[PDB]
Design a protein around this ligand. Structure first.
Ligand SMILES: *[C@@](C)(CO)[C@](*)(O)[C@H](Cc1ccccc1)NC(=O)[C@H](Cc1ccc(OC)cc1)NC(=O)[C@H](C)NC(=O)CN1CCOCC1
Ligand SMILES: *[C@@](C)(CO)[C@](*)(O)[C@H](Cc1ccccc1)NC(=O)[C@H](Cc1ccc(OC)cc1)NC(=O)[C@H](C)NC(=O)CN1CCOCC1
Ligand SMILES: *[C@@](C)(CO)[C@](*)(O)[C@H](Cc1ccccc1)NC(=O)[C@H](Cc1ccc(OC)cc1)NC(=O)[C@H](C)NC(=O)CN1CCOCC1
Ligand SMILES: *[C@@](C)(CO)[C@](*)(O)[C@H](Cc1ccccc1)NC(=O)[C@H](Cc1ccc(OC)cc1)NC(=O)[C@H](C)NC(=O)CN1CCOCC1
Ligand SMILES: [Mg+2]
Ligand SMILES: [Mg+2]
Ligand SMILES: [Mg+2]
Lengths: 195, 222, 212, 222, 196, 204, 233, 196, 195
């Protein structure tokens, strides 16, 4: 875990998530996908404590998929984010809390708008034009404050994202082995293979 | 806090200051520390503010239900027994230090309760951070066979000692007089010896001083 | 604190904020974080205020004694090493300093030295130091080229502090700008973030996260 | 284990005008929840038209003032009775404080006087010697209460010219000694209301080219 | 506290000082540490005021319910109930209790129950912080089958010394006399006992 | 790791002549890192306004909880809850979590629709009601707010004057606190109109 | 770094129209054990100063020796040792204050709270406090330990500010001090009944009273107190 | 330890038990806690065996050097030397010493020096862990100007009680009589004192 | 600091040392030379506590240079390594020890042999065919156990070294920003600029 970013542009939400899984002094894997598709137009990236992350992601995934089958209907990104926040808000006062931070990128088909939510392990939800968890934010927020515009295209968003990854690769102490980038828009979720 | 209780001829009087603190900051300059458990049983509370209010309301509620059940006016010893068993059960974690007083068919009474659940009996008592300042006055001026007006004077003097000399106490003096055969009289702000002096200047700003970005009407209706 | 200084075609830019903090209490908004050692040497301050203020002033006295004894202005390397050797003697005692010794000499040219209280001493072209250093790096790195004009370099330095001033809770107040050339340092004014932010937001079109 | 430090409470305040400067401080001295003295001055005339106050731990405060007063004395002996300028005093105090960097004087220090151009000057220090000249500074227990009020009323922060769309700031101007004393008195009465360690009395030392004048005002004693 | 209970010819007498402390501050200088759990079964309370109070109230309840079903309980029975509470809750209690009662068959009896919750039947018992200073005196002066006046003097002199040396003890010396005649309360003020 | 000062923020409420004002900053951070500049801390249930400072997750949770409770109240009572009653509901709900509390500093503000009286109240994290004629403060810059309010405030201010006073109180207090600021909102509340104004403040 | 072993409790004092009064009980406590009963904690220096000391007694005895030595040293080569160049209360205090602060700064304090009461050569009343931290302050009334919490409130009812001092006589002042000593005996668990009292007057000089006792005590109401709540017997 | 020193008509008597402990083990059951610092100035030692020993040896050295220059030292002088060592090294010492000596001018004198290093001149003094149990007894029984036989009985009865209650005390009761006649050592065995 | 390697081959000693200087969550520099020339045929690399490293290296450098001027003679690598070890052996029982680990690569001109010494901050000296300090050794020692031969050329040694750097770049958690490589042989010390 470690680096997860998110950028909402005019017509899409773009999520970037590091590929490294490190344990001790060994990088065990360099192709890890730190994300789950909750629904056709909703993607969730995650970072935090080992084990907790995937266990939580898949648990949320199962619940949203259950809802979809029951109602034959897709929950809005806002509704999914509120469900996720409440689960984390319960968790923090449990015997053993989930130590997982998430970004939820979705395209609301009723509003025809992209939406990005940042939720930490305490259950602190905020809707944002761009988001980050962990130490990444200390570089990317100021960078995006400068270069981000609300009316950008998906291509402009990807170039803006390349600028973030370059900065992180230059100044971050750890080798996070690049990122997997995914785009969420009106046509659903797709992965950029060459980044 | 500073709180006191003083017995007299035909009843009992309790008093309290009106300062509430958060560390060195005065949160409330005129809070009410005198609490009604039943019409003629009143409680002065020091310690954790929420705990004194919550424990006094709970027992007060149960005393009312008990009074209705038994078709009798409630007794001070019942409130005392219920408070102490509740506080003991929580091993001091409910930080309520109370002076319980009142009149009932048995007579007039004065007790104190500590957070861990121990109770005392006395003719004069004082609790809180300014209890030593108050008790110094009580030990100096108290006597057997006090009148009503003498006991009020002694009680308020003991509270004043706390107000002036204790940093955890200040502002005003509240009093409650519980006499046998009469209605209890709650004297809110019986003394107000700490009125703020006129300010040197009016800090009313010229309209338009504050820079505004947006305006909008908020909808409160359905 | 956020302080930076970077080397480029036209010399050195040095930019700092002006906030001082005691926990979450904002102690000052008008603090001076650049100390003018001589007409060709500057020192930036980050970390303990007293530590920085006291020892960099002291550094200035040592640099003056050098030019009296040697009849020649002290090198940036030698000046930085006086400070680094001093704080190394105190290593472990609890001094807190992140400083940058920026200046020009004939033998060295424009030079920047990072010196901190653990005894680290590094020559380099770009450094950002302070609690908000990462926010400054984000903007500075992503816009930096060696061939920047004096006008563009001054703005980038100013804009990088503004970026950090905005995001970092323990940075802010105002931006102090300096430009170091072969002829010495030149002050380029105090710029209050209270006005600068809105001016930059409007003119540049940036800071879209903020309610306009 | 022995704790060499203590907290004696109180608060101080310095404001600079065009041809004058004031250094105010309450006269209350405390430990924990007890009042030690209702009138114990901590603002001192140190000679050469320099007034000084070191608020916090009084033992360290008195020690510092004593050492600085002595520093002024030896400055005269060593430099032919030359007047110690306020800027030179400030630098000297930094070295006094930083001399004990690893066993600090637990005090927020403020000095006031006139600079070498005759204009009002206030310098303020942290416990280990960092200093800065300002128009305005509150120090001590109630510094966090008073300082933002001074930002607003002395430096006109967040105040814009009415009708200018929050584009033109309220212009900076020097305040008259009458206006400054109004702000000092209102600052201290406000601090007295909400801070338990502040009260009893207010003593202001005013510094002009003619010398050092004093003014005293009663504060609430609760 | 300084407390004691002493058996004698006609029954038993309980004795106690009247000081309650919160640190070095005296919260109550007229405390009643001698408490009734039954008509002629009383106890002296030392240790935590809240703990001993809560215990005594539970015991008083148990003996009242005992009396309703089986008639007057023995002093041994009362001590057993105290023990049961003190022993089973030893981790959460700070209570040193002396139990004293008068039967007509068994006459005067004294049981002491220290911190652990053990029971010890004795001719006389001393307890509380101030008792340490009078072990020597009481051992040398106690005699079995004393008279009422002798036992009152024995307790008065003993507690006077305990009060003199122990800062945690003081105020008045309360006593409770348990005999076939009935229950008698005695009080003795500083001006008397201090100059013994 | 002090729950009440991780995210930061402030709320202040004041009374005027036949009106009340309640204001809050917009910052939400994670210690030094500023994260959001749109995080409003004032909510309303009918005509009763509630401001909440402290740990942001609990701010959100309590809002959702009091919306829940006031909605059921209205369905059963067939009327909007009043400020005095809502104040009691807040106190009960907070004390219910006595030994595992919400790390919050709530502030109630509103005008009783029956009597027309302006009402404000404050609470600690554990439920203790703090009623006041003049003003209530809350948050990481409470000391600053206390000092600003105590000096600037005067009784019976008109809605337009009260706006200036409460705004200047919040702004100058926020500027002396690292964890507060990043924008501000002020609600001016009259008997049957409410005006919401966003303030221009320094963004550092 | 120390811990106090044998300790003395409250020292109380106040100013009146012509001079100052100071008092302290004769007890030397050893924790909760009331060990020593013949301890004098008021120590006169000359005929114009009395130093009252609370806290550690071993450190008190050290301070006694210092004051005793100060008198000796002042007399050396001093023809006016019993006249113009006699030891003033202000000199004695400043010396002690210096020592106290120096010892705290060396992390090895004299574990005491000290009140220096006396009358200056010009007739002015002197009353000032100093403790183990080197903290100093002055007030119309001063008290240490429990005295600060219980005596000061009572003494301030007589002299609440500077203007009340001329209006207060030695009879009224002594009465308040003796009353305060009684209150401390009721409430302080490390106090004794026996105490000493000293009056330093600008006309009548130093009057040192030994073996005083607390008296006129109210204990009779105790007979009426039964149990802790419900007990009727 | 239980130790005491008592002045009387003809001079002063020092008394002590003979138990030395390392935990609950008795390292020495025949210890001599009464030690000579001068011909007719002796001390009782309580607290750390090593500390009190090292102090007594230094004092004995100081008084031997005092005597060589200025003749016989007073008992007060001896106490002052003990104090000086105990007070100045209070952080590194655990020593409770009673000093007792016989002058011809001053007769019998007793000085007690507790942990802090303070000095207290008394008619009699008690110290050590076992002294706590006999404060009551000794206060009630001590009289000024007792005879030799009365003082011996007073010490014997007192230490007997201290020994009875204190586990840290026991063995024999040693005594040292200081008068104008000279120095007399006394010993009393368990079989005698236990059944007092 | 962090990664310092050393390989002794037939006719030379090759030292590789990471270029990164990291402090907190920021890589302050990516071109740092963690080495000092003690004498014309003796090079010392170093890694450890901030400040201590350079202060110690330059102190040793000054002493060896002083010796060279005094005797007009170059100390053997063995002699220099023994001097360095003794300084560290003194240091470890000082009030504040130097927390510096070093590798000393030298060419003995009298023996015509390359020599590599590994010395840790305790003053633990060993002569080795290949050496490493810190976590690097946990990968490189086993790798070199397999691929190293005693008769290799300088070019073969550099290829062997490339194999180590590749392994570290693959499996190490932190980004150490590559290495500066230097060769010590009969002709002295020179730097490989393209690695
Ligand atoms: C005086 C003022 C104490 O200084 C009184 O005891 C007073 C009693 C009182 C009763 C009713 C209404 C108002 C006031 N107590 C307080 O004002 C009390 C002081 C206090 C603070 C912290 C404590 O923690 C051990 C105990 C007592 N102040 C409060 O209770 C304030 C309003 N609340 C808090 O500070 C919140 N605390 C509550 C306890 O849990 C931690 C957070
Ligand atoms: C930004 C604001 C983050 O701190 C900067 O680092 C700033 C740097 C600076 C340099 C020169 C002039 C002004 C400002 N640093 C501070 O403002 C500094 C933060 C800090 C506090 C304490 C520290 O010790 C661990 C280190 C850094 N603030 C101060 O120095 C404040 C004004 N003073 C104190 O906290 C007083 N302390 C200092 C340490 O000794 C005890 C007393
Ligand atoms: C003498 C005075 C001291 O031991 C007695 O034992 C006395 C017995 C007594 C007092 C009143 C009524 C009946 C019997 N005990 C006390 O006065 C007692 C001292 C004590 C406190 C706590 C203890 O451990 C839990 C042991 C002894 N005083 C109190 O209980 C007072 C009322 N409360 C406090 O001091 C506050 N305590 C609460 C418990 O936790 C520690 C703080
Ligand atoms: C009675 C027995 C207990 O207090 C006496 O005080 C007795 C006095 C005595 C004994 C022999 C000769 C002259 C005087 N003291 C001891 O027997 C003493 C107990 C004691 C030990 C350590 C202390 O703190 C430092 C205080 C009292 N016993 C010893 O000194 C024995 C010989 N040694 C130990 O127990 C080992 N100690 C060494 C010091 O550190 C702790 C472990
Ligand atoms: Mg007060
Ligand atoms: Mg900021
Ligand atoms: Mg034995």
């Amino acid at each position: 875990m470690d680096i997860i970013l998110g950028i909402r542009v005019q017509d899409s939400v773009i999520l970037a998530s590091s590929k490294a899984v490190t344990r001790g002094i060994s990088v065990l894997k360099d192709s890890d996908d730190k994300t789950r598709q909750l629904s056709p137009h909703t993607l969730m990236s995650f970072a935090g404590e080992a084990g907790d992350t995937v266990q939580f992601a898949e648990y949320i995934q199962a619940n949203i998929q259950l809802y979809s089958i029951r109602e034959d209907y897709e929950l809005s990104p806002q509704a999914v984010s509120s469900f996720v926040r409440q689960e984390l808000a319960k968790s923090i006062r449990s015997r053993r809390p989930y130590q997982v931070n998430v970004l939820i990128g979705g395209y609301d088909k009723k509003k025809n708008k992209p939406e990005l939510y940042q939720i930490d392990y305490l259950g602190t939800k905020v809707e944002l034009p761009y988001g980050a968890h962990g130490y990444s934010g200390f570089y990317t927020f100021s960078l995006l404050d400068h270069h981000y515009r609300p009316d950008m295209t998906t291509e402009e968003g990807l170039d803006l994202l390349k600028l973030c990854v370059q900065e992180l690769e230059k100044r971050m102490p750890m080798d996070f082995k690049g990122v997997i980038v995914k785009i969420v828009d009106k046509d659903g979720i797709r992965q950029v293979d060459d980044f | 806090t500073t709180i006191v209780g003083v017995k007299f001829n035909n009843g009992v009087v309790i008093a309290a200051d009106t300062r509430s603190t958060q560390g060195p900051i005065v949160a409330d300059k005129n809070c009410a520390k005198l609490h009604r458990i039943s019409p003629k049983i009143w409680c002065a509370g020091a310690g954790t503010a929420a705990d004194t209010e919550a424990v006094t309301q709970l027992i007060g509620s149960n005393i009312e239900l008990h009074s209705l059940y038994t078709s009798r006016e409630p007794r001070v010893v019942s409130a005392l027994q219920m408070l102490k068993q509740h506080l003991f059960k929580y091993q001091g974690h409910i930080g309520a230090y109370l002076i319980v007083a009142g009149v009932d068919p048995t007579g007039s009474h004065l007790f104190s309760i500590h957070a861990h659940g121990s109770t005392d009996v006395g003719y004069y008592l004082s609790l809180g951070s300014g209890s030593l300042a108050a008790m110094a006055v009580l030990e100096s001026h108290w006597k057997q066979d006090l009148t009503k007006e003498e006991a009020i004077k002694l009680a308020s003097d003991a509270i004043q000692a706390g107000i002036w000399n204790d940093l955890g106490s200040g502002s005003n003096v509240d009093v409650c007089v519980m006499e046998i055969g009469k209605d209890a009289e709650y004297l809110r702000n019986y003394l107000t010896p700490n009125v703020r002096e006129e300010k040197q200047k009016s800090y009313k700003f010229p309209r338009g001083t504050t820079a505004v970005l947006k305006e909008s009407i908020v909808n409160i209706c359905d | 604190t956020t302080t930076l200084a970077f080397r480029f075609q036209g010399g050195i830019i040095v930019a700092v904020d002006s906030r001082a903090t005691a926990g979450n209490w904002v102690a000052s908004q008008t603090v001076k974080k650049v100390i003018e050692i001589n007409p060709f040497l500057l020192g930036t301050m980050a970390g303990g205020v007293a530590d920085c203020q006291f020892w960099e002033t002291w550094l200035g006295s040592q640099c003056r004694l050098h030019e009296l004894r040697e009849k020649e202005r002290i090198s940036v390397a030698a000046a930085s090493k006086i400070l680094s050797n001093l704080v190394y003697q105190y290593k472990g005692a609890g001094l807190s300093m992140g400083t940058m010794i920026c200046g020009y000499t004939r033998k060295e040219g424009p030079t920047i030295y990072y010196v901190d209280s653990d005894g680290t001493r590094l020559k380099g072209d770009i450094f950002c130091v302070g609690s908000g250093q990462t926010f400054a790096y984000g903007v500075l790195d992503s816009n930096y080229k060696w061939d920047l004009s004096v006008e563009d370099a001054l703005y980038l330095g100013k804009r990088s502090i503004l970026a950090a001033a905005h995001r970092d809770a323990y940075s802010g107040g105002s931006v102090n700008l300096y430009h170091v050339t072969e002829d010495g340092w030149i002050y380029h004014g105090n710029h209050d973030v209270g006005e600068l932010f809105w001016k930059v937001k409007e003119e540049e079109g940036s800071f879209n996260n903020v309610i306009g | 284990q022995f704790n060499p430090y203590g907290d004696n409470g109180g608060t101080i305040l310095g404001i600079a005008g065009e041809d004058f400067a004031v250094l105010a401080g309450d006269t209350r001295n405390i430990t924990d929840y007890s009042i030690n003295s209702r009138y114990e001055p901590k603002v001192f005339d140190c000679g050469d038209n320099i007034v000084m106050s070191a608020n916090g731990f009084a033992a360290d405060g008195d020690a510092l003032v004593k050492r600085f007063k002595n520093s002024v004395k030896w400055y005269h002996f060593d430099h032919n009775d030359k007047k110690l300028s306020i800027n030179s005093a400030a630098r000297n105090i930094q070295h006094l404080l930083y001399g004990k960097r690893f066993f600090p004087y637990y005090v927020h220090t403020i000095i006031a006087g006139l600079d070498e151009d005759g204009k009002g000057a206030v310098y303020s220090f942290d416990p280990v010697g960092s200093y800065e000249r300002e128009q305005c500074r509150a120090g001590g227990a109630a510094a966090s209460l008073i300082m933002p009020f001074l930002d607003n009323q002395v430096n006109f922060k967040n105040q814009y010219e009415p009708g200018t769309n929050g584009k033109v700031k309220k212009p900076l101007k020097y305040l008259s000694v009458e206006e400054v004393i109004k702000l000092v008195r209102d600052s201290f009465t406000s601090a007295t209301e909400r801070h338990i360690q502040v009260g009893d009395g207010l003593e202001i030392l005013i510094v002009t080219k003619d010398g050092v004048r004093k003014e005293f005002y009663e504060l609430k004693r609760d | 506290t300084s407390i004691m209970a002493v058996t004698f010819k006609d029954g038993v007498i309980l004795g106690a000082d009247s000081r309650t402390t919160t640190g070095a501050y005296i919260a109550n200088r007229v405390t009643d540490k001698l408490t009734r759990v039954h008509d002629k079964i009383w106890c002296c309370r030392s240790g935590s005021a809240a703990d001993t109070q809560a215990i005594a109230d539970i015991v008083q309840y148990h003996l009242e319910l005992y009396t309703s079903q089986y008639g007057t309980p023995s002093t041994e029975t009362a001590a057993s109930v105290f023990k049961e509470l003190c022993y089973e809750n030893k981790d959460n209690l700070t209570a040193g209790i002396i139990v004293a009662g008068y039967d007509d068959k068994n006459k005067g009896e004294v049981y002491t129950i220290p911190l652990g919750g053990s029971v010890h039947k004795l001719p006389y018992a001393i307890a509380g912080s101030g008792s340490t200073f009078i072990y020597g005196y009481c051992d040398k002066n106690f005699r079995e089958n004393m008279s009422k006046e002798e036992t009152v003097d024995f307790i008065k002199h003993s507690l006077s010394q305990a009060i003199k040396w122990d800062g945690s003890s003081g105020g008045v010396i309360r006593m409770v006399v348990l005999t076939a005649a009935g229950v008698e309360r005695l009080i003795f003020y500083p001006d008397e006992y201090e100059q013994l | 790791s002090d729950p009440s000062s991780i995210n930061g923020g402030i709320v202040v409420a004041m009374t005027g002549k036949d009106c009340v004002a309640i204001a809050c900053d917009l910052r939400l951070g994670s210690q030094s890192l500023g994260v959001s500049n749109k995080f409003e801390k004032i909510f309303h249930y009918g005509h009763v306004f509630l401001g909440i400072t402290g740990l942001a997750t609990d701010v959100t949770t309590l809002n959702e909880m009091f919306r829940y409770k006031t909605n059921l109240y209205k369905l059963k009572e067939e009327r909007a809850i009043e400020p005095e009653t809502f104040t009691q509901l807040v106190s009960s709900s907070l004390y219910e979590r006595r030994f595992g509390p919400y790390f919050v500093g709530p502030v109630v503000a509103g005008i009783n629709s029956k009597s027309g009286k302006p009402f404000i109240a404050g609470f600690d994290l554990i439920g203790c009601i703090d009623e006041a004629k003049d003003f209530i403060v809350s948050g990481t810059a409470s000391d600053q707010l206390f000092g600003m309010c105590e000096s600037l405030y005067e009784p019976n201010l008109e809605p337009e004057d009260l706006f200036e006073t409460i705004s200047q109180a919040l702004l100058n207090a926020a500027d002396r606190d690292a964890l507060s600021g990043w924008g501000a909102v002020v609600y001016i509340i009259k008997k049957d109109e409410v005006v919401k104004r966003y303030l221009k403040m320094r963004q550092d | 770094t120390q811990q106090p072993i044998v300790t003395g409790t409250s020292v109380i004092s106040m100013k009146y129209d012509n001079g100052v009064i100071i008092a302290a009980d004769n007890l030397g406590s050893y924790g909760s054990l009331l060990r020593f009963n013949g301890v004098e904690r008021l120590i006169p220096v000359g005929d114009n100063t009395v130093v009252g000391i609370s806290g550690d007694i071993s450190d008190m005895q050290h301070i006694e020796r210092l004051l005793k030595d100060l008198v000796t040293e002042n007399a050396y080569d001093n023809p006016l040792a019993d006249a113009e160049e006699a030891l003033e209360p202000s000199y004695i205090f400043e010396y002690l204050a210096t020592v106290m602060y120096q010892r705290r700064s060396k992390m090895n304090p004299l574990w005491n709270a000290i009140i220096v009461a006396g009358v200056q050569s010009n007739g002015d009343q002197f009353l000032r406090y100093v403790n183990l931290l080197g903290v100093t302050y002055s007030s119309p009334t001063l008290a240490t330990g429990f005295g600060a919490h219980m005596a000061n409130p009572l003494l301030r009812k007589v002299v609440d500010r500077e203007s009340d001092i001329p209006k207060t006589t030695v009879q009224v002042a002594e009465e308040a001090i003796v009353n305060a000593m009684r209150v401390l005996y009721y409430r302080d668990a490390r106090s004794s009944r026996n105490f000493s009292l000293a009056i330093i007057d600008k006309n009548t000089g130093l009057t040192f009273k030994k073996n005083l006792q607390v008296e006129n005590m109210k204990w009779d109401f105790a007979k009426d107190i039964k149990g802790y709540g419900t007990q009727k017997i």
